[PDB]
Each structure stands twice: as C-alpha cells, then as structure tokens.
Design a protein around this ligand. Structure first.
Ligand SMILES: CC(C)CCC[C@@H](C)[C@H]1CC[C@H]2[C@@H]3CC=C4C[C@@H](OC(=O)CCC(=O)O)CC[C@]4(C)[C@H]3CC[C@]12C
Ligand SMILES: CC(C)CCC[C@@H](C)[C@H]1CC[C@H]2[C@@H]3CC=C4C[C@@H](OC(=O)CCC(=O)O)CC[C@]4(C)[C@H]3CC[C@]12C
Ligand SMILES: CC(C)CCC[C@@H](C)[C@H]1CC[C@H]2[C@@H]3CC=C4C[C@@H](OC(=O)CCC(=O)O)CC[C@]4(C)[C@H]3CC[C@]12C
Ligand SMILES: CC(C)CCC[C@@H](C)[C@H]1CC[C@H]2[C@@H]3CC=C4C[C@@H](OC(=O)CCC(=O)O)CC[C@]4(C)[C@H]3CC[C@]12C
Ligand SMILES: CC(C)CCC[C@@H](C)[C@H]1CC[C@H]2[C@@H]3CC=C4C[C@@H](O)CC[C@]4(C)[C@H]3CC[C@]12C
Ligand SMILES: CC(C)CCC[C@@H](C)[C@H]1CC[C@H]2[C@@H]3CC=C4C[C@@H](O)CC[C@]4(C)[C@H]3CC[C@]12C
Length: 1195
C-alpha cells in the first residue's frame, strides 16, 4: 500500500478508543504533518467505489421512474443506496438515547439510599453500589461508545458527499454544449463547494428525527411516574421553547441579511479607497472616504449590535431555560400539595436535563440540516438531469453542413459547409475574427451536431484547441493523456519533436507538475504541450486550431515544418492559420465569413495574554470588566443556588414529623429563578455589548491607521491582503468572536459550577481532580499540535478537487476529443480521495480527543457517584442528589467547552491581525501648526535644491542631486526612458515619500507644512484615472465646495455636460464601479474637470493622454493650454509632439537631471540626449518637431 491505514487491522477495543491513531499524534507532536503522513482511505471509501455505487442506484431510479411515468427522485436513490447501512447505526442511537433516560432512574435509586439511610444495612449499601455501577455503565456508553458510533454516522455523510461529487463530475464531462450555456462553470463548482458539503452534516442528526420525539415521550412517561401531572408544566416550557427559538431565529436572519448589505457597501468602498489610495492621497480626499466608511460602519454596527441582542438573549435563554423548566414543574408540584423530596426533585432535574438538549438543540438542528440537505439534493438532481451529448456518437466528410449553437431567427453560425479530406490532405481555414473561426473544427469534433446536411468521420481525432488547456498534473501525463507510456514514441515526441529546446531547462525535466497546482507555463509552452499531446495520441484525423499565436515565429517554422509536415504526411489534417506559409502548404483552402463558405480551392487559383488584554481593554473600561465578571459569577452562583435551594428545601422537608412555610420556601425559590434569568440576560448582553464595542473601536483605529499609512505600506502589501483585514478579520470581531467568546465563558462557568458543587459536597474530590486537570492540560496541547496540522492538511487538499473540475470543465472539447473521460475521471478520483484521507484524519482525530476528553468526564462522574457512597454517613440526600445531578451534566458541557476554546484561539489570530494594522507607521500630519495663508501659491514657483528621493528607507536613490528652478507659469516638459525618474519627481513633490534635500514652493519649504496643506494646493491629472462609485457630483466635488453652475460649466468645458445631462439622475447619476460606464478617455475628462474646478496655480500632468484616443487627446491638450495658461504646468509626456512647444524640458536619465533648457536650445545641441531621443523616432516628423520648437522662441 502507498500509505497503510491502521484502521484496517484495529481490534474492536482499538477502534472504540481510537487507540490505532496514537502513532499519528506521536509524529505530529514532533513534526509538522504533511500529506505523506496521512493514511490512505479504506477501500470501501474510495471515490471510485462510492460514486460508481451510487450511479447504479441513480441509474435504476431514472429507469424505474420513466417506466412508472414519473419524475426521478435523487432522494429515493440516495436512500435506496445507504438506508440499509444507516439504519444499523440507529440501533446504537436507541441504546445511547435510552442510556440518557436510564441514568436519571438509577440516580433516583442511589439517592433513595440516603433518603432511607441507616448505616448498618450492609444489604442496602451493596444494592446502592449496584445502582452506582449501572449508572457508571450508562455513563460509559454515553462517553466511550458514543464516539465510535459518531464516527460512523459521519462517514455515512462523507460517503454520500464523495459519491455525489463523483456523480456530478462524471456528469460534468457529459454536459451538452447547450447545458454548458444554461449553467456557469462557477455554478457547477458551487455544487462541489457548497451544496454537496451539506451531506456531511445531515447524517449526524438524521436519527434524531425519530429518536428526538421518541425520547420526549419516554422522558414524559417517566416524569409522570416521578412527578405526576405536574410534569406537563415543565414539558410545556420545553415544547413552547421550540417555536420561540425558531421564530426569533428567523427574526435574527432578517437582521443578518440587512446587516450584510451595509457590510458589502463598506467593503466595496474599502476596495475603492485601497486600490485608489495613491491618487486619493494626491487629491487629499481621505476625509471624503473617511466619512463614507464612518457612515456605512455606524449603520452596519447598529444592526450588528441590535442583532447581537437576539444572539445574546438566545444564549441567555439556553442558559436559564433549565431553571424555568424545573421552576414551573416544582412550583406546580408543591402548590398541588406534594412535598419536596430530594430523589424526586433530582430525577426530574436530570430528566429535564436529558431531554432539553434533544428537544431544544438536536431535534431542531436535525430538522434544519435535513431541510437544507433536501435543498441540495434536489438542486443537484436538476444538474444530474441536464442534457448530454449522444452517448456513443480513415476519413472525415462534410456536405451541406448547417448547424446552430442555438436555434434562432439569426443566421446559422455555420451553413452550407462542404469539404472532404482524405489521408494526408491538409486544409487551411481562413477568415476574419468571428467569421466561423474554430466552429468548423468544433463541428468535426461533433460539438455541433448537424441540423441540416451531414458530416461523418472515421478514425481517431486529435485536437489542439485555441485555448491551450492543460490539466493539473505531470507534463509527461499531459502528453500521454490516458494512452499508455511507450519509450520510443514518447522519446520521439520529445526528441524528434524537439520539446527539449524549452524543456531541458527552466522545467526541471518532464516530470514537472503543470497546471493550476503551480509551475504555471506560458501559453506558448502549453500550445506545444498540446501539440505534443496531439502527436503522441497520433490520431488519424488531426485538428489544429491555434498553435501559432502562442509560439514565436521562429518556433512556428520549426513546429510546422519539422513535425506537422514530416510526421503527419499521411494524417488527415485541418489547420486554422494566419501564417501564410502554411496557407500555401495546404492542399486546399477554405475561406469563410460569418458562417458562409466564401471560397474553396487550392491557392493556385489566386496569541498571548497581551492580545486578550488589548481586545478586552478596547471596548470597555476595566471597571466594566470588574462589573462584567460580577455578572458572570452571579449568574452561575444563582444558577447553582437555584438547585441547592431545592436540595435544601428537600432536606428541610426531610426532618418534619407541621409543614414548611410554603410562602417562604417557594418565595425564595422564585427569587433565585428570577435572579439566574435576569443575571443570565444581563451577563449575556453586557458581554456582547463590550465585545461589539471592542470591534467598533478596533475598526475605527485600524481604518484611521490605513488612511494615514504611507504609500510605501500600500506598495509592500497587496490590495487583497489589506482588504482581508477589513473583509474577514473584522468580520469575525463583529459577528462570530463575541458569540464564541460568550458561549465559551458561559459554558466554562457551567463546568466550574459542576466541579465546585462536587468539591463543596465532597471536599476530598479536589485531590483526584488535580491529576485530571494536569492530564487534560497535557492532552489538550498534545492534541492541538496535531489537530491544527490535519485542519491545515484538510483545507489545503480541498482546492485541488474543486480546481480539477473547474479546469476540466473548461477543457471539455479537448477531453472528449481524445476520449480521455476515463483518464480525467481517475484524476478527479485521485484528488477526491486525497482529500478524503485528510477528512478521514479530521473525523478520527476529533473523535480521538473526544473519547479521551469524555473519559475524564466519566471518571469524574464515577468519583462523585462512588465517593458520595463510600462517605455516605457524611452526606445527605440533598447534597448527593445535587452533586450527582450536576456531575451527569459535565459530559456534554466539558467537551463543548473545550470545543469552543480553540475556536476562540483560532479567531483571536484575526484580532492580532486587526491590532497589527492599528499600530502601522503614520505619514507626517496632514496639517502642521505652521500653515500657509489662504493664498499661498501666489506665483507657483517650484525650486528643487539638491533633492534626493527614495521610495524606501535605505532603497536606491531614484532622484539624485536634482536641482532646478521652475519659473512662474513656466511649462516644463519631463522626458526620459522608463525608469528615468519621471513619475518619481511627482512622488517627491507630493511627498508620497519624504525626499532628502529641500523642495521650495513659493519660498515655503514643502516639508514644513502639512501634507493636506501641500497636496490640496497642487493639481494632478494621473495617467490611469480613477472614478469612484457615487454621484458625478461627489466625483467632481466630494466636499460640496462648488456650486452646481460651476460644476456644469466645468463639465461643459470638458464636453461632458451633454453626456451627463442625458443621464437619468443628472449630477446625482450613480456611476458604476471604476466608472465602467465611461471609456478610459472619458475618465480623464472628469479628472481635467477636477483640475479645472480646483483652480490651482500648479498643475501636474503625468503621461495622462497617452492612454487616450487622439481626438480626446487633442481636446484635453487644447483645454489644458486654454484653461491652465496662467498656471505653472509640469507635463510628463511620452509623445514629444505634446510638449515640444514647452518653455523648458527637464531631461531625466537614470534618475539624473541630465539636461534642462528650452526644447530648441536642447535640439540645437546635436549632441544633446534630447536630440538623440528625437532621432530615435526614425520618422520625418522629427524635422517637424525641430521646426515647431524653432518657431516658438522668436516670439
Ligand atoms: C415517535 C417517533 C417515531 C415519531 C417520528 C417523527 C415523524 C412522524 C416526523 C417528526 C419530524 C418529521 C420531520 C421534520 C422535518 C422534515 C424536514 C421537512 O423537509 C423540508 O421541509 C425541506 C424540503 C422540502 O419540503 O422542500 C419534511 C421532512 C422531515 C424530515 C420530517 C419527516 C417526518 C418526521 C421525522
Ligand atoms: C461575587 C458575587 C456574585 C458574590 C458571590 C458570593 C457567593 C460565592 C457566596 C455568597 C453567600 C454564600 C452562601 C451563604 C450561605 C449559604 C448557606 C449555607 O447553608 C447553611 O449553612 C445551612 C444549611 C446547611 O446545613 O448547609 C450553604 C452555603 C451558602 C449557600 C453560601 C454559598 C456561597 C455564597 C452564595
Ligand atoms: C442572588 C445571589 C447572587 C446571592 C447569594 C445568596 C442568595 C441567593 C440568598 C437568597 C436566599 C438566602 C438563604 C435564605 C435562607 C437561609 C436560611 C437560613 O436559615 C434559617 O433558618 C434562617 C431563619 C431566620 O433567621 O429567619 C440560613 C441562610 C439561608 C440558607 C440563606 C443563604 C443565602 C441565600 C441562598
Ligand atoms: C441588576 C441586575 C439584574 C443586573 C443588571 C445589568 C445591567 C447593568 C445590564 C442589563 C442589560 C444591559 C444592557 C443591554 C442592552 C444595552 C443596549 C445597547 O444598546 C443597543 O444595543 C442599541 C442598538 C441600536 O441603537 O439599535 C447598549 C448596552 C446596553 C445598555 C446594556 C448595558 C448593561 C445592561 C443595562
Ligand atoms: C442498553 C440500554 C438499555 C442502555 C444501558 C442500560 C443498561 C446498562 C441497564 C438498563 C436496565 C439495567 C438493569 C435494571 C435493574 C437492575 C437491578 C439492579 O440490582 C442493578 C442491575 C440491573 C439488572 C440493571 C443492569 C443494567 C441495565 C440492563
Ligand atoms: C461562578 C464561579 C466563578 C465560581 C463557582 C461559584 C458557585 C458555582 C459555587 C461557589 C460556592 C459554592 C457553594 C459552596 C457551599 C455549598 C454548600 C454545600 O452543602 C452545597 C453546595 C454549595 C451551595 C456550593 C454550590 C456551588 C457554589 C455556589
């Protein structure tokens, strides 16, 4: 075996305790686990086996259904396959759910030992140990045997998930090209990614659909025997708790849905502000986007906070419902005139405890998961019933062939087509873009069926598609593509077809792994790989669609002459080509246009304590956390005292011969119930408020740091990386961490309550509770080191299986051409059961911890049950009833506590990422105490005095010693090769990084004044304009400093007025994302309007119109000269015609101011590097440039 699996050889006890898995933890404690450490899946769990199995039942179901004249039901097929195995796990559900019910009955019988206690009855003591021992076996069933069962019901979901994944991939290969229109590739991946994933969860609780209500009937029958008619008072609260949970849960969903719209609006604006952060800074618009996020955040956080009250009250109801259920029972019980006894009390408390979880959690969750599983099942059935290609389909022959991609009143896509080619004949296909193009080849493949006329083909086909598709796998396999390896032929297609030219190097040999997994090849390599695949498949019919666009022309001749011609001289070849050498080499040419055959013939016709402290001490003062701790402990103290009082009341009743003052005992009992409920909600709401206020503050600080972060930070960090902290990390802080943190500390205090009643009742239990505490701490670490690794392995192995369907579904015509559907299926199965073994580790690692984590819980129950009974003369029925009623509760709480403490830790990593972006470095303050006057650029003189510029501290000097004077209103051109420093001069002038040296503007040193004092008072037209979402008004003036008349006038000057007046909102017309409603040229017209509106005396133009069509270029250039004649203008240009008439040109080379003079005085020096750059144009317009400069300076 490749990776032996110990579960095949495991003894019954070995797999009950998951003892077979211990060596994995030995390894993962020492090393990081890798995919080679995973155990291979069991043979019955292979994706091939599971998917092939379910196809049999689904095939029969489709056959059965049509014989019955009915719709197929995939739910019937799924049941037919799995029902016989999954009902056998129902036997243990009956055994386990009756152990939940029989614990309370034997609890009562051990308590009856204390109620009737006399120390001399040795027979009674022995009988009490029998009840304690049966209570232990019931406890061990719930603790030890539950987990082997729970592993099996989880495998039943994996087997359904893996079988369905195989089925839908097998179908995905078979989809008709019409069905590939009705469905997006992203939707079919969504089946694998989201819908089939529902089947893991459905089988966890599917047995509670029957075991849930059946247990309620059993518990109510026993409560009637225990408590009589008064049991309906508690069961009413249990049952009525179901509609309230569901109804208020639906209300929570409405707020959840209304929150997301503000979240997405915020994140979209975040995407815009981060991507545009460099131009936003140069405009000094951070205050605009600051308000916009602040408003979107206040709306979002209000509904987050309001939604958190429902989740706070949901947890508060789950906490305190146990108190109300037993209150209304025992209030009714005693008012009806039955006295409180300790045995009948704590049997009832335990019976309500047993059934509350099934009624209020497992049964409604079973319904919810089965509801949305059936959604997925029918959703996938719609896909499984999509249309398919005719399932079974040397010459290829075509006459009158007429076909449609879809039937329409339009022209056919291909019509009248008539050609026929014999062994060795080659046809070139020629036409404009969209003329018919690849569709003729698609017709030979049979991807278009004949609607009229006929085609036929005999022998095998090879197909080098226009898109160079390659599957994720070894290059060797990409060439073999499901045909067997042969040394001679494979070496022939790599030696004689000299792939070695670009494969002996930069590829690590031919065993390199191609595709989405990595090593991603350029398109030219894939085309040769696809052609080499075609040569290796060595087909009789041979279709080339576009090898030649991908490879270079030098490779093209080698590729065509030495292989396509010499090897395929007898093979029936069709070649779509634009390289005329191959057109002439063809035996015939087919010319087509818009699906019409124009001409046919031969060419001869022509996380430590610091993170928790900084998370907590960010939304509440430490005085609140003192009061918050008091609410938490008071909630749990009152929770336990509500049960202690009932044992005290039972003890006080026990000594009467007279009656108890029922007003007083029932009155305090009602006060304790009110206390635990009111402290329950108060605790839960204050936690949620403090932690949601913590995310409010951490966001405000994080966002504030991002706007004031220097541009260097945005260059080092990708746009997606910064966005993820605003999308995902703060997402956790807003709506999942405060829930998990409350649920943790809510349950944590429940565990402390359970173990402190036991120590308070039996103080000796604290001695065997220190070994258990130490064991659990080591166990948790010893687990977590391996658990985090298999969690990482599992998450990493998913993306291959989704990626394989995505790329395979993109390559359907290639896959079907070679008939490699079996080979591509096996590749999916290999990826599907690489994950299935990572998921197998996920299931069994979790259950290895849980069985041990429940072993210490069951050990605690045994110590209490037997220590209460060894020390029986010390205790009394109320104390023993209390301590045992609680010990039995530990099982489900302590495992959940530990399963909500790693989620807290795994989410606090997002908090430290949010805190990381809170302490970013800041650029200089936007406004220093020294400020310019309201009229500061009075002359617009700019002086660079020995200016040095670096983009990074300690980076290479990009500007060197640059020293230049720019006179008032002077127009300065900046020219240079790429990297000469043109754009770096702007970054120095706007102080996007701090320049070394001094930049003076109007005698004011630009490094003394604030960044908004400097950046507002200079206008820039960038090369790549950004239009933000929102109104045209907000894109022209987000501060409303200008009147609508001024805005319309500026829009008229840039000729946008008519276009914008035609918009249905005029100035309040909402622009689409990035201004996609406008062309790139139009976007710069908006920027020119921005510059015109600001009326700054300094305008900087950075290669702006080089992205722009000549007519709009002429418009922008004309308007700049007209409107900014009185301004100092710095124009960086690539087209010298646009600046040849400047007053001066700064010439940059390699970051140095090589020349700075009047353009003609430059060109009058024939040795100037301006003159060289002009002569490098190679065009007579260089003379016109020289004359154009000369004619300026006489004036
Ligand atoms: C004493 C014991 C044996 C009683 C057994 C209980 C059954 C009589 C009932 C109780 C809960 C019912 C289930 C409750 C909810 C659902 C989900 C529901 O599915 C949906 O509503 C979503 C799919 C759709 O209907 O479109 C209908 C089936 C099912 C499994 C019901 C099937 C029949 C169940 C198991
Ligand atoms: C931090 C805030 C929420 C205060 C929490 C304090 C509690 C931990 C303390 C305060 C008063 C204590 C109680 C004071 C009095 C009693 C009565 C006492 O009952 C008797 O002594 C008579 C019956 C018997 O013989 O035990 C049992 C302990 C108990 C409940 C104590 C349990 C612990 C309590 C609730
Ligand atoms: C609400 C929480 C956070 C505060 C913790 C203490 C309380 C829950 C109080 C409420 C009722 C109190 C009990 C009420 C009555 C008694 C009986 C009392 O014994 C008597 O016989 C009193 C006779 C009398 O003086 O009238 C001893 C204290 C005790 C257990 C009190 C202990 C403290 C209790 C449980
Ligand atoms: C005397 C015992 C029973 C303890 C009392 C505890 C109080 C101090 C707790 C109980 C409920 C808590 C409140 C629960 C709800 C809110 C509303 C919350 O405001 C909103 O959620 C508004 C949302 C919106 O604007 O839509 C701010 C915290 C606050 C006042 C909490 C502050 C602390 C309160 C008042
Ligand atoms: C398998 C199901 C029922 C859950 C597990 C409960 C099993 C372990 C329980 C259910 C009923 C129990 C029996 C009920 C009563 C008695 C009498 C007493 O002197 C103890 C032993 C004996 C004979 C019990 C043995 C254990 C027992 C069979
Ligand atoms: C909430 C956390 C932080 C601390 C645990 C507080 C609660 C659970 C603890 C604190 C003091 C404990 C009480 C101390 C003494 C007694 C008397 C005993 O004869 C029965 C139990 C009883 C009544 C205990 C019940 C549990 C108790 C109230």
């Amino acid at each position: 075996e490749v990776k032996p699996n110990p579960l095949q050889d495991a003894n019954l006890c070995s797999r009950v305790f998951f003892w077979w898995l211990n060596p994995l933890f030995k390894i993962g404690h020492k090393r990081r686990l890798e995919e080679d450490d995973m155990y291979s899946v069991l043979p019955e769990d292979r994706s091939q086996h599971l998917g092939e199995e379910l196809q049999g039942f689904w095939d029969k179901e489709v056959l059965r259904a049509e014989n019955d004249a009915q719709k197929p039901s995939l739910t019937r097929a799924i049941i037919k396959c799995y029902w016989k195995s999954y009902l056998v796990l129902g036997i243990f559900t009956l055994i386990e759910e009756s152990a939940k019910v029989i614990q309370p009955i034997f609890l009562g019988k051990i308590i009856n030992y204390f109620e009737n206690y006399d120390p001399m009855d040795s027979v009674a003591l022995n009988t009490a140990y029998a009840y304690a021992t049966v209570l232990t076996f019931c406890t061990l069933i719930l603790a030890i045997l539950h987990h082997l069962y729970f592993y099996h019901v989880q495998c039943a979901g994996m087997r359904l998930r893996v079988a369905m994944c195989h089925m839908i991939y097998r179908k995905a290969l078979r989809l008709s090209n019409m069905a590939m229109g009705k469905t997006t590739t992203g939707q079919i991946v969504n089946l694998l990614s989201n819908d089939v994933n529902k089947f893991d969860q459905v089988t966890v609780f599917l047995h509670f659909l029957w075991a849930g209500p059946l247990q309620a009937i059993a518990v109510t029958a026993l409560l009637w025997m225990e408590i009589g008619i008064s049991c309906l008072a508690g069961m009413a609260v249990l049952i009525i708790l179901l509609p309230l949970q569901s109804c208020f849960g639906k209300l929570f969903s409405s707020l959840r849905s209304k929150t997301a719209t503000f979240t997405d609006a915020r994140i979209r604006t975040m995407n815009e502000v981060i991507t545009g952060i460099r131009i936003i800074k140069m405009y000094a618009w951070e205050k605009s986007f600051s308000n916009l996020i602040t408003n979107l955040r206040k709306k979002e956080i209000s509904k987050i906070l309001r939604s958190s009250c429902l989740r706070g009250m949901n947890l508060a109801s789950f906490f305190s419902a146990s108190k109300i259920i037993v209150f209304v029972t025992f209030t009714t019980y005693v008012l009806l005139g039955s006295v409180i006894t300790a045995s009948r009390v704590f049997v009832a408390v335990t019976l309500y405890g047993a059934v509350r979880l099934t009624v209020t959690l497992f049964f409604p969750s079973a319904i919810e998961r089965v509801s949305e599983a059936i959604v997925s099942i029918r959703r996938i059935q719609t896909f499984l019933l999509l249309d398919e290609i005719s399932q079974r389909n040397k010459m290829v022959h075509v006459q009158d062939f007429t076909a449609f991609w879809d039937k329409a009143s339009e022209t056919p896509t291909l019509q009248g087509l008539s050609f026929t080619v014999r062994p060795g004949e080659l046809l070139a296909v020629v036409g404009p873009v969209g003329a018919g193009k690849s569709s003729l080849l698609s017709a030979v493949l049979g991807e278009l069926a004949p609607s009229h006329g006929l085609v036929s083909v005999h022998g095998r086909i090879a197909y080098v598609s226009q898109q160079p598709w390659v599957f994720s796998g070894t290059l060797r396999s990409n060439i073999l593509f499901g045909k067997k390896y042969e040394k001679e032929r494979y070496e022939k297609v790599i030696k004689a077809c000299a792939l070695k030219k670009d494969l002996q190097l930069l590829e690590d040999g031919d065993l390199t792994v191609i595709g989405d997994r990595g090593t991603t090849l350029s398109g030219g390599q894939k085309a040769r790989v696809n052609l080499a695949r075609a040569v290796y498949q060595d087909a009789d019919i041979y279709l080339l669609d576009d090898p030649l666009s991908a490879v270079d022309a030098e490779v093209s001749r080698h590729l065509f002459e030495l292989c396509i011609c010499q090897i395929l001289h007898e093979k029936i070849t069709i070649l779509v080509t634009h390289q005329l050498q191959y057109l002439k080499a063809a035996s015939q040419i087919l010319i087509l246009k818009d699906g019409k055959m124009v001409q046919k013939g031969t060419y001869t016709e022509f996380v430590g304590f610091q993170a928790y402290k900084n998370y907590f001490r960010a939304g509440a003062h430490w005085i609140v956390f003192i009061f918050l701790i008091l609410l938490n402990t008071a909630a749990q103290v009152a929770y336990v005292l509500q049960d202690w009082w009932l044992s005290y009341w039972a003890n006080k009743q026990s000594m009467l011969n007279e009656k108890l003052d029922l007003n007083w005992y029932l009155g305090i009992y009602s006060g304790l119930t009110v206390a635990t409920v009111l402290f329950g909600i108060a605790r839960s709401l204050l936690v949620f408020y403090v932690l949601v206020n913590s995310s409010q503050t951490l966001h405000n600080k994080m966002f504030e740091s991002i706007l004031k972060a220097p541009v260097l930070f945005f260059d080092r960090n990708p746009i997606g990386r910064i966005l993820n902290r605003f999308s995902k990390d703060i997402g956790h802080l807003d709506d999942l961490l405060p829930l998990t943190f409350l649920d943790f500390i809510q349950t944590l205090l429940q565990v402390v309550g359970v173990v402190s009643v036991a120590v308070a009742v039996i103080p000796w239990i604290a001695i065997p509770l220190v070994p258990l505490g130490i064991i659990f701490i080591f166990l948790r670490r010893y687990f977590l080191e391996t658990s985090r690794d298999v969690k990482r392995l599992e998450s990493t192995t998913r993306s291959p299986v989704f990626s394989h369907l995505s790329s395979s579904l993109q390559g359907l015509w290639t896959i079907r051409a070679y008939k490699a559907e079996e080979r591509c299926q096996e590749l999916f199965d290999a990826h599907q059961d690489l994950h299935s073994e990572a998921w197998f580790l996920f299931l069994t690692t979790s259950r290895w911890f849980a069985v041990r984590l429940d072993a210490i819980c069951a050990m605690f129950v045994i110590i209490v049950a037997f220590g209460s009974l060894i020390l029986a003369k010390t205790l009394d029925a109320g104390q023993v009833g209390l301590a045992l009623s609680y010990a039995l509760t530990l099982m489900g709480m302590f495992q959940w506590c530990v399963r909500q403490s790693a989620e807290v830790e795994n989410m606090m990593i997002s908090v430290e990422r949010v805190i990381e972006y809170t302490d970013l470095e800041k650029e200089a303050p936007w406004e220093y105490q020294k400020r310019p006057p309201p009229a500061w650029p009075h002359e617009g003189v700019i002086i660079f005095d020995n200016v040095n510029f670096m983009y990074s501290p300690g980076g290479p000097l990009v500007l060197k010693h640059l020293t230049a004077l720019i006179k008032s209103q002077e127009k300065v051109g900046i020219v240079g090769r790429t990297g000469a420093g043109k754009s770096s001069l702007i970054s120095a002038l706007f102080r996007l990084s701090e320049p070394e040296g001094k930049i003076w503007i109007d005698k004011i040193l630009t490094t003394e004044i604030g960044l908004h004092d400097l950046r507002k008072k200079m206008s820039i037209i960038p090369q790549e304009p950004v239009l933000f979402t929102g109104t045209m008004r907000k894109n022209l003036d987000p501060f409303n400093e200008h009147t609508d008349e001024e805005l319309w006038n500026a829009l008229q000057e840039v000729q946008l007025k008519e276009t914008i007046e035609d918009l249905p909102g005029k100035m309040d017309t909402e622009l689409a994302e990035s201004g996609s409603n406008f062309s790139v040229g139009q976007r710069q017209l908006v920027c020119l309007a921005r510059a015109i509106l600001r009326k700054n005396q300094i305008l900087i133009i950075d290669e702006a119109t080089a992205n722009v069509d000549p007519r709009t270029d002429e418009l922008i250039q004309k308007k700049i000269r007209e409107k900014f004649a009185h301004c100092t203008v710095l124009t960086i240009a690539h087209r010298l015609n646009t600046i040849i008439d400047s007053d001066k040109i700064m010439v940059l080379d390699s970051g140095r101011l090589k020349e700075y003079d009047e353009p003609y005085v430059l060109l009058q020096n024939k040795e100037s590097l301006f003159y060289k750059m002009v002569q490098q144009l190679g065009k007579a317009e260089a003379a016109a440039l020289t004359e154009t400069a000369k004619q300026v300076y006489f004036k």
